[PDB]
Amino acid sequence: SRLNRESVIDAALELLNETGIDGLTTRKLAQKLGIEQPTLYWHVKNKRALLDALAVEILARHHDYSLPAAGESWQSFLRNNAMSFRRALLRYRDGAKVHLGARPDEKQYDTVETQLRFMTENGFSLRDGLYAISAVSHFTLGAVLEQQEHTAALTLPPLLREALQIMDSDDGEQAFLHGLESLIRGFEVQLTALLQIV
Amino acid sequence: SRLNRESVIDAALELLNETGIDGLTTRKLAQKLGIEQPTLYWHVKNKRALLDALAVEILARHHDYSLPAAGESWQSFLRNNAMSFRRALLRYRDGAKVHLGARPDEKQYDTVETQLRFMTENGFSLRDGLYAISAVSHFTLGAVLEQQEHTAALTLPPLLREALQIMDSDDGEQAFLHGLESLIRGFEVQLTALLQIV
Ligand SMILES: CN(C)[C@@H]1C(O)=C(C(N)=O)C(=O)[C@@]2(O)C(O)=C3C(=O)c4c(O)ccc(Cl)c4[C@@](C)(O)[C@H]3C[C@@H]12
Ligand SMILES: CN(C)[C@@H]1C(O)=C(C(N)=O)C(=O)[C@@]2(O)C(O)=C3C(=O)c4c(O)ccc(Cl)c4[C@@](C)(O)[C@H]3C[C@@H]12
Ligand SMILES: [Cl-]
Ligand SMILES: [Cl-]
Ligand SMILES: [Cl-]
Ligand SMILES: [Cl-]
Ligand SMILES: [Cl-]
Ligand SMILES: [Cl-]
Ligand SMILES: [Cl-]
Ligand SMILES: [Cl-]
Ligand SMILES: [Cl-]
Ligand SMILES: [Cl-]
Ligand SMILES: [Mg+2]
Ligand SMILES: [Mg+2]
């Protein structure tokens, strides 16, 4: 079939939903495209470069709240951004594992730069703005993962019994959204304090 | 060599530091113990059961702030617990990936039950106490991971340039500890509010 970049990525994402990250191989990617392994290699050198590519395209195709809206609050931007990043990670099987094994890439450079500039324009130091952005990022990847490598594994005292019922009634959305607010109000308490003891 | 449980786990952890999670195989575990593959199989049926075992023993050997101290505040307990869980995950190569692929096990049942009871005794609902515990857990696993599958990968605009310098001056400890406080103050703001609009 066509082996332009955007066709190869299309096929590899389709393969990732079928196999999960651990079973995604270049060998299986060549079979799906109808080509011999040395043909694929001219296009894709290894699994790592494939995964680097998928991590970037997943956000480029599906992460549509990369950037704050005109005049949006930093609070509203972190909420929207986090929700967008979660949805984009959940869209493909092992999406979070695909994300984690990858470089904040040339192509994204100016997106992540804009995010940091926006935090500093809203009264954060670079360090504290980066700590907020990183915290939201780590919390969000941790939640999405838990689910996703949860499901991978499977292919009581009473409170733990009720809690596993609770955590498995939606798919971590409630718990995700409640922690998101907790974390944002924490940053705002920190920001407002300045040099006051808090 | 000896193939009691605690010897097999000792050898497998030693293997995990040498290979990382992706290269840990039962075949390599049998070679390290000086035994044939069918001998290992009587003891260990597959990689998954091995990883299930390692995840539990890692916390049992190294997570020493599972339980709150006599009269400790819930705030102080979440801080200490999170720091303990981070240290225990970082102790072995791909520790966080080992954690994620595993069941809150029979053996841990009463530990995690105690944590939830302690939150409800401190004025949290079961749901809100579970949301706090889960948030701390997801944030902590997300941070530790980023590092660990960061390093796996490797084997600029100015703010991003300074920020990668910042994130890579300690090993995420500062950023981890700052988000930890943000998250705890967020839970306390939520808890104190009751039914007030907040
Ligand atoms: C989830 N959200 C907060 C951020 C986001 O929306 C991103 C985006 N491409 O739109 C990211 O790349 C992020 O999701 C993302 O992945 C980031 C990230 O991985 C990262 C790493 O690894 C190292 C240094 C930095 Cl400065 C970053 C960093 C801050 O750029 C984050 C940003 C987040
Ligand atoms: C990091 N810390 C907050 C907790 C902790 O210290 C644990 C421990 N064994 O000492 C955990 O198991 C935890 O680190 C841990 O791993 C938990 C966990 O995985 C989990 C899962 O997967 C499903 C349901 C529940 Cl209720 C839990 C849960 C709440 O027990 C958490 C607890 C945390
Ligand atoms: Cl072509
Ligand atoms: Cl193309
Ligand atoms: Cl491969
Ligand atoms: Cl294959
Ligand atoms: Cl707003
Ligand atoms: Cl023996
Ligand atoms: Cl034993
Ligand atoms: Cl194996
Ligand atoms: Cl092997
Ligand atoms: Cl205390
Ligand atoms: Mg990232
Ligand atoms: Mg866990």
Coordinates of C-alpha atoms and ligand atoms in Angstrom, one line a residue:
Chain A
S1 CA 0.0 0.0 0.0
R2 CA 1.2 3.7 0.2
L3 CA 4.2 4.1 2.6
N4 CA 4.1 7.9 3.0
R5 CA 4.6 8.9 6.7
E6 CA 0.9 9.6 7.3
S7 CA -0.2 6.1 5.8
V8 CA 2.5 4.3 7.9
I9 CA 1.3 6.1 11.1
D10 CA -2.3 5.3 10.2
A11 CA -1.4 1.6 9.9
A12 CA 0.8 1.5 13.0
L13 CA -2.0 3.1 15.2
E14 CA -4.5 0.5 13.8
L15 CA -1.9 -2.2 14.7
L16 CA -1.5 -0.8 18.2
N17 CA -5.3 -1.1 19.0
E18 CA -5.1 -4.8 17.7
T19 CA -1.9 -5.8 19.6
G20 CA -1.2 -3.3 22.4
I21 CA 2.2 -1.7 22.8
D22 CA 4.0 -5.0 23.9
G23 CA 2.9 -6.9 20.7
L24 CA 3.4 -4.1 18.2
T25 CA 6.3 -5.2 16.1
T26 CA 7.8 -3.9 12.8
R27 CA 7.3 -7.5 11.5
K28 CA 3.5 -7.3 12.1
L29 CA 3.5 -3.7 10.7
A30 CA 5.1 -5.0 7.4
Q31 CA 2.5 -7.9 7.2
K32 CA -0.4 -5.4 7.7
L33 CA 1.0 -3.0 4.9
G34 CA 1.5 -6.0 2.5
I35 CA 5.3 -5.5 2.3
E36 CA 8.6 -7.3 3.1
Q37 CA 10.6 -6.3 6.2
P38 CA 13.5 -4.6 4.3
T39 CA 10.9 -2.4 2.4
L40 CA 9.4 -1.3 5.8
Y41 CA 13.0 -0.6 7.1
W42 CA 13.6 2.1 4.4
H43 CA 10.5 3.9 6.0
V44 CA 10.8 2.9 9.7
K45 CA 14.1 1.9 11.2
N46 CA 12.9 0.3 14.5
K47 CA 10.0 0.0 17.0
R48 CA 11.5 3.0 19.1
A49 CA 11.4 5.5 16.1
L50 CA 7.8 4.1 15.4
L51 CA 6.7 4.7 19.0
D52 CA 8.5 8.2 19.0
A53 CA 6.3 9.0 15.8
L54 CA 3.1 7.6 17.3
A55 CA 3.4 9.6 20.6
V56 CA 3.7 12.9 18.6
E57 CA 0.9 12.1 16.1
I58 CA -1.5 10.9 18.9
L59 CA -1.3 14.5 20.4
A60 CA -1.3 16.2 17.0
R61 CA -4.4 14.4 15.9
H62 CA -6.4 14.2 19.1
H63 CA -5.0 16.7 21.8
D64 CA -7.0 19.8 20.7
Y65 CA -6.5 21.9 24.0
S66 CA -2.8 22.3 23.7
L67 CA -3.1 26.1 23.7
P68 CA -5.2 28.4 26.0
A69 CA -8.2 30.3 24.6
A70 CA -8.0 34.1 24.2
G71 CA -8.2 35.5 27.7
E72 CA -8.6 32.1 29.4
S73 CA -7.5 31.9 33.1
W74 CA -4.4 29.8 33.9
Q75 CA -6.9 27.7 36.2
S76 CA -9.3 27.1 33.2
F77 CA -6.3 26.3 30.9
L78 CA -4.8 23.6 33.2
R79 CA -8.3 22.0 33.6
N80 CA -9.1 21.9 29.8
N81 CA -5.4 21.0 28.9
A82 CA -5.5 18.1 31.4
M83 CA -8.9 16.8 30.2
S84 CA -7.7 17.0 26.5
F85 CA -4.4 15.2 27.3
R86 CA -6.3 12.4 29.2
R87 CA -8.8 11.9 26.2
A88 CA -5.9 11.9 23.7
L89 CA -3.9 9.2 25.8
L90 CA -7.1 7.1 26.2
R91 CA -8.0 7.1 22.5
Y92 CA -5.5 4.2 21.6
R93 CA -4.7 0.9 23.5
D94 CA -1.6 1.6 25.8
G95 CA -1.7 5.2 24.7
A96 CA 0.0 6.3 28.0
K97 CA 2.9 3.8 27.6
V98 CA 3.3 5.1 24.0
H99 CA 3.4 8.7 25.4
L100 CA 6.0 7.9 28.2
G101 CA 8.6 6.3 25.9
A102 CA 9.1 9.5 23.8
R103 CA 10.8 12.9 23.4
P104 CA 9.0 16.4 23.7
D105 CA 9.7 16.5 19.9
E106 CA 11.0 19.4 17.6
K107 CA 7.4 19.5 16.1
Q108 CA 5.8 20.2 19.6
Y109 CA 8.6 22.6 20.7
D110 CA 6.6 25.8 20.3
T111 CA 3.4 24.3 21.8
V112 CA 5.1 23.4 25.1
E113 CA 7.1 26.8 25.0
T114 CA 3.8 28.7 24.6
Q115 CA 2.4 26.8 27.7
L116 CA 5.4 27.8 29.9
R117 CA 5.3 31.5 28.6
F118 CA 1.5 31.6 29.3
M119 CA 2.1 30.4 33.0
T120 CA 4.9 33.0 33.5
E121 CA 2.6 35.7 32.0
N122 CA 0.0 34.7 34.7
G123 CA 2.5 35.5 37.6
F124 CA 4.2 32.1 38.0
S125 CA 8.0 32.0 38.0
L126 CA 9.3 29.6 35.2
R127 CA 10.1 27.0 38.0
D128 CA 6.7 27.1 39.7
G129 CA 4.9 27.3 36.3
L130 CA 6.9 24.2 35.2
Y131 CA 6.1 22.4 38.5
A132 CA 2.3 23.1 38.0
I133 CA 2.5 21.9 34.3
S134 CA 4.6 18.8 35.3
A135 CA 2.4 17.9 38.3
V136 CA -0.8 18.0 36.0
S137 CA 1.1 16.0 33.4
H138 CA 2.3 13.3 35.9
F139 CA -1.1 13.0 37.8
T140 CA -2.9 12.7 34.4
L141 CA -0.4 10.1 32.9
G142 CA -0.5 8.2 36.2
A143 CA -4.4 8.0 36.2
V144 CA -4.6 7.0 32.4
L145 CA -1.9 4.4 32.8
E146 CA -3.5 2.7 35.8
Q147 CA -6.6 1.7 33.8
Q148 CA -4.5 0.9 30.6
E149 CA -1.9 -1.5 32.2
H150 CA -4.7 -2.6 34.6
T151 CA -6.6 -4.1 31.5
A152 CA -3.2 -5.5 30.2
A153 CA -2.8 -7.5 33.5
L154 CA -6.3 -9.2 33.3
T155 CA -6.0 -10.3 29.6
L156 CA -11.6 -8.5 50.2
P157 CA -11.9 -6.2 53.3
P158 CA -15.0 -4.1 53.1
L159 CA -13.6 -0.5 52.3
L160 CA -11.2 -1.9 49.6
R161 CA -14.4 -3.9 48.3
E162 CA -16.5 -0.7 48.1
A163 CA -13.5 1.3 46.7
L164 CA -12.8 -1.1 43.8
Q165 CA -16.6 -0.9 43.1
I166 CA -16.2 2.9 43.2
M167 CA -13.0 3.2 41.1
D168 CA -14.7 0.7 38.6
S169 CA -18.2 2.4 38.1
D170 CA -17.0 5.0 35.5
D171 CA -13.4 4.6 34.2
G172 CA -11.5 6.8 36.7
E173 CA -13.2 10.0 35.3
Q174 CA -14.8 11.2 38.7
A175 CA -11.5 10.4 40.6
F176 CA -9.5 12.1 37.8
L177 CA -11.6 15.3 37.8
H178 CA -11.7 15.6 41.7
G179 CA -7.9 15.3 41.9
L180 CA -7.5 17.8 39.0
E181 CA -9.5 20.4 41.1
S182 CA -7.5 19.6 44.3
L183 CA -4.2 20.1 42.4
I184 CA -5.3 23.4 40.7
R185 CA -6.6 24.9 44.0
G186 CA -3.3 23.9 45.5
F187 CA -1.3 25.8 42.8
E188 CA -3.6 28.9 43.3
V189 CA -3.0 28.8 47.1
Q190 CA 0.8 28.6 46.4
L191 CA 0.6 31.4 43.8
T192 CA -1.5 33.8 45.9
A193 CA 0.8 33.4 49.0
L194 CA 3.9 35.1 47.4
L195 CA 6.5 35.3 50.3
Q196 CA 3.8 34.8 53.1
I197 CA 4.2 31.7 55.2
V198 CA 1.4 29.3 54.0
Chain B
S1 CA 20.9 -22.7 43.7
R2 CA 18.0 -22.5 46.3
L3 CA 14.6 -22.0 44.7
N4 CA 12.5 -21.1 47.7
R5 CA 10.2 -18.1 47.0
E6 CA 12.5 -15.5 48.7
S7 CA 15.6 -16.7 46.7
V8 CA 13.7 -16.7 43.4
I9 CA 12.5 -13.1 44.1
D10 CA 16.1 -12.0 45.2
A11 CA 17.4 -13.3 41.8
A12 CA 14.6 -11.8 39.7
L13 CA 15.1 -8.3 41.3
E14 CA 18.9 -8.6 40.6
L15 CA 17.9 -9.6 37.0
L16 CA 15.5 -6.7 36.7
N17 CA 18.3 -4.1 37.5
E18 CA 20.6 -5.8 34.8
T19 CA 17.9 -6.1 32.0
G20 CA 15.1 -3.6 32.8
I21 CA 11.5 -4.9 32.7
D22 CA 11.3 -5.4 28.9
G23 CA 14.4 -7.7 28.9
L24 CA 13.5 -9.7 32.1
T25 CA 12.6 -13.2 30.8
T26 CA 12.1 -16.5 32.6
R27 CA 14.8 -17.9 30.2
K28 CA 17.3 -15.4 31.6
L29 CA 16.0 -16.0 35.2
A30 CA 16.7 -19.8 34.8
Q31 CA 20.3 -19.1 33.4
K32 CA 21.0 -16.8 36.4
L33 CA 19.8 -19.5 38.9
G34 CA 21.9 -22.3 37.1
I35 CA 18.7 -24.3 36.3
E36 CA 16.9 -25.6 33.2
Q37 CA 13.7 -23.8 32.1
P38 CA 11.3 -26.7 33.2
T39 CA 12.9 -26.6 36.7
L40 CA 12.1 -22.8 36.9
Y41 CA 8.5 -23.4 35.6
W42 CA 7.7 -25.7 38.7
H43 CA 8.5 -22.5 40.7
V44 CA 7.5 -19.6 38.4
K45 CA 4.8 -20.2 35.7
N46 CA 5.4 -17.1 33.6
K47 CA 6.7 -13.5 33.5
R48 CA 3.3 -12.1 34.6
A49 CA 3.2 -14.1 37.9
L50 CA 6.9 -13.1 38.4
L51 CA 6.1 -9.4 37.9
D52 CA 3.0 -9.7 40.2
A53 CA 5.4 -11.2 42.9
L54 CA 8.1 -8.5 42.3
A55 CA 5.5 -5.6 42.6
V56 CA 4.4 -6.9 46.1
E57 CA 7.9 -7.7 47.4
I58 CA 9.3 -4.3 46.3
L59 CA 6.7 -2.6 48.7
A60 CA 7.1 -5.2 51.4
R61 CA 10.9 -4.8 51.5
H62 CA 11.3 -1.1 50.8
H63 CA 7.9 0.8 51.3
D64 CA 8.3 1.4 55.1
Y65 CA 5.6 4.3 55.5
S66 CA 2.6 2.1 54.5
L67 CA 0.9 3.0 57.9
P68 CA 0.4 6.3 59.7
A69 CA 2.3 6.9 63.0
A70 CA 0.3 7.0 66.3
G71 CA -1.6 10.4 66.2
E72 CA -0.2 11.5 62.8
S73 CA -2.3 14.0 60.8
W74 CA -3.8 12.8 57.5
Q75 CA -1.7 15.6 55.8
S76 CA 1.5 14.3 57.3
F77 CA 0.5 10.7 56.5
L78 CA -0.2 11.4 52.8
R79 CA 3.2 13.3 52.6
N80 CA 5.3 10.5 54.2
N81 CA 3.4 7.7 52.4
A82 CA 4.0 9.4 49.0
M83 CA 7.7 9.9 49.7
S84 CA 8.0 6.2 50.8
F85 CA 6.1 4.9 47.7
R86 CA 8.4 7.1 45.4
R87 CA 11.6 5.8 47.1
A88 CA 10.4 2.1 46.9
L89 CA 9.4 2.5 43.1
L90 CA 12.8 4.2 42.3
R91 CA 14.9 1.5 44.1
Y92 CA 14.8 -1.0 41.1
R93 CA 15.1 -0.3 37.3
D94 CA 11.6 0.2 35.8
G95 CA 10.2 -0.1 39.3
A96 CA 7.1 1.9 38.3
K97 CA 6.3 -0.3 35.3
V98 CA 6.7 -3.3 37.6
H99 CA 4.2 -1.7 40.0
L100 CA 1.6 -0.8 37.3
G101 CA 1.2 -4.3 35.9
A102 CA 0.0 -5.9 39.2
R103 CA -2.9 -6.5 41.6
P104 CA -3.5 -4.8 45.1
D105 CA -2.6 -8.3 46.4
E106 CA -4.2 -10.5 49.2
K107 CA -1.0 -9.9 51.2
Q108 CA -1.4 -6.0 51.1
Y109 CA -5.2 -6.2 51.6
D110 CA -5.2 -5.0 55.3
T111 CA -2.5 -2.3 54.6
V112 CA -4.6 -0.5 51.9
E113 CA -7.8 -1.2 54.1
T114 CA -6.1 0.5 57.1
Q115 CA -5.2 3.5 54.8
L116 CA -8.9 4.0 53.7
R117 CA -10.2 3.5 57.3
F118 CA -7.6 6.2 58.6
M119 CA -8.9 8.7 55.9
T120 CA -12.5 8.1 56.9
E121 CA -11.6 8.4 60.6
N122 CA -10.1 11.8 59.7
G123 CA -13.5 13.2 58.3
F124 CA -13.2 12.1 54.7
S125 CA -16.1 10.2 53.1
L126 CA -14.9 6.8 51.7
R127 CA -15.2 8.3 48.1
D128 CA -13.2 11.5 48.9
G129 CA -10.7 9.6 51.0
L130 CA -10.2 7.2 48.1
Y131 CA -9.9 10.1 45.6
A132 CA -7.1 11.7 47.8
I133 CA -5.2 8.3 48.1
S134 CA -5.7 7.6 44.4
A135 CA -4.6 11.1 43.3
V136 CA -1.4 10.9 45.4
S137 CA -0.8 7.4 44.0
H138 CA -1.3 8.5 40.3
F139 CA 0.8 11.7 40.6
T140 CA 3.6 9.7 42.4
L141 CA 3.6 6.8 39.8
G142 CA 3.4 9.4 36.9
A143 CA 6.5 11.3 38.2
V144 CA 8.6 8.2 39.0
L145 CA 7.7 6.7 35.6
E146 CA 8.7 9.8 33.6
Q147 CA 12.3 9.4 34.7
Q148 CA 12.4 5.6 34.4
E149 CA 10.9 5.3 30.9
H150 CA 12.8 8.6 30.1
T151 CA 16.1 6.7 30.7
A152 CA 14.8 3.6 28.7
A153 CA 14.3 5.9 25.6
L154 CA 17.9 7.3 25.6
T155 CA 19.6 3.8 26.0
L156 CA 15.3 24.3 21.7
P157 CA 13.1 27.4 22.5
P158 CA 14.5 29.2 25.6
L159 CA 11.9 28.4 28.4
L160 CA 11.8 24.7 27.4
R161 CA 15.7 24.9 27.4
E162 CA 15.8 26.3 30.9
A163 CA 13.0 23.9 32.1
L164 CA 14.7 20.7 30.9
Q165 CA 17.8 22.1 32.7
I166 CA 15.5 22.6 35.8
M167 CA 13.8 19.2 35.6
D168 CA 17.3 17.5 35.1
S169 CA 19.2 19.2 38.1
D170 CA 17.9 16.8 40.8
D171 CA 16.0 13.7 39.6
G172 CA 12.4 15.3 39.7
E173 CA 12.5 15.4 43.6
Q174 CA 11.9 19.3 44.0
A175 CA 9.1 19.1 41.3
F176 CA 7.7 16.0 43.0
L177 CA 7.7 17.6 46.5
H178 CA 6.2 20.9 45.3
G179 CA 3.3 19.1 43.5
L180 CA 2.8 16.9 46.6
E181 CA 2.1 20.0 48.8
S182 CA -0.1 21.5 46.1
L183 CA -2.2 18.3 46.1
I184 CA -2.4 17.9 49.9
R185 CA -3.5 21.7 50.4
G186 CA -6.1 21.1 47.7
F187 CA -7.5 18.1 49.6
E188 CA -7.6 20.1 52.9
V189 CA -9.4 23.0 51.1
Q190 CA -12.0 20.5 49.8
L191 CA -12.3 18.7 53.3
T192 CA -12.7 22.0 55.3
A193 CA -15.4 23.3 52.9
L194 CA -18.1 20.7 53.7
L195 CA -21.3 21.8 51.8
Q196 CA -20.0 25.5 51.3
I197 CA -19.5 26.6 47.7
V198 CA -15.7 26.6 47.2
Ligands
LIG1 C1 -0.4 17.9 29.7 N1 0.0 19.3 29.6 C2 0.3 19.9 30.9 C3 1.1 19.5 28.6 C4 0.7 19.4 27.2 O1 -0.6 19.7 27.0 C5 1.5 19.0 26.1 C6 1.2 19.2 24.7 N2 2.2 18.7 23.8 O2 0.2 19.8 24.4 C7 2.6 18.2 26.4 O3 3.5 17.9 25.7 C8 2.6 17.5 27.8 O4 1.6 16.6 27.9 C9 3.9 16.8 28.0 O5 4.0 15.5 27.6 C10 5.0 17.3 28.7 C11 6.2 16.6 28.9 O6 6.3 15.3 28.6 C12 7.5 17.3 29.3 C13 8.7 16.6 29.4 O7 8.7 15.2 29.3 C14 9.8 17.2 29.7 C15 9.9 18.6 29.9 C16 8.7 19.3 29.7 CL1 8.9 21.1 30.0 C17 7.5 18.7 29.4 C18 6.2 19.5 29.3 C19 6.1 20.5 30.4 O8 6.3 20.3 28.1 C20 4.9 18.7 29.4 C21 3.6 19.4 28.9 C22 2.4 18.6 28.9
LIG2 C1 0.7 5.3 47.5 N1 -0.2 5.2 48.7 C2 -1.2 6.2 48.5 C3 -0.8 3.8 48.8 C4 0.1 2.9 49.4 O1 1.0 3.4 50.2 C5 0.1 1.5 49.2 C6 0.7 0.5 50.0 N2 0.6 -0.9 49.6 O2 1.3 0.8 51.0 C7 -0.5 1.1 47.9 O3 -0.7 -0.1 47.7 C8 -0.7 2.1 46.8 O4 0.6 2.6 46.4 C9 -1.4 1.5 45.7 O5 -0.6 0.9 44.8 C10 -2.7 1.6 45.5 C11 -3.4 1.0 44.3 O6 -2.7 0.6 43.3 C12 -4.8 0.8 44.3 C13 -5.4 0.2 43.2 O7 -4.7 -0.1 42.1 C14 -6.8 0.0 43.2 C15 -7.6 0.3 44.3 C16 -7.0 0.9 45.4 CL1 -8.1 1.3 46.7 C17 -5.6 1.1 45.4 C18 -5.0 1.8 46.6 C19 -5.8 3.0 47.1 O8 -5.0 0.8 47.7 C20 -3.6 2.5 46.4 C21 -2.8 2.8 47.7 C22 -1.4 3.3 47.5
CL3 CL 4.5 4.3 -1.4
CL4 CL 2.8 12.0 4.5
CL5 CL 10.0 -4.8 16.4
CL6 CL 6.4 -10.2 15.4
CL7 CL -11.4 31.4 32.3
CL8 CL 15.7 -25.5 46.2
CL9 CL 10.9 -18.5 51.1
CL10 CL 9.5 -14.7 29.7
CL11 CL 15.4 -14.5 26.8
CL12 CL 1.2 15.3 62.1
MG13 MG 5.0 14.0 28.2
MG14 MG -0.8 0.6 42.9

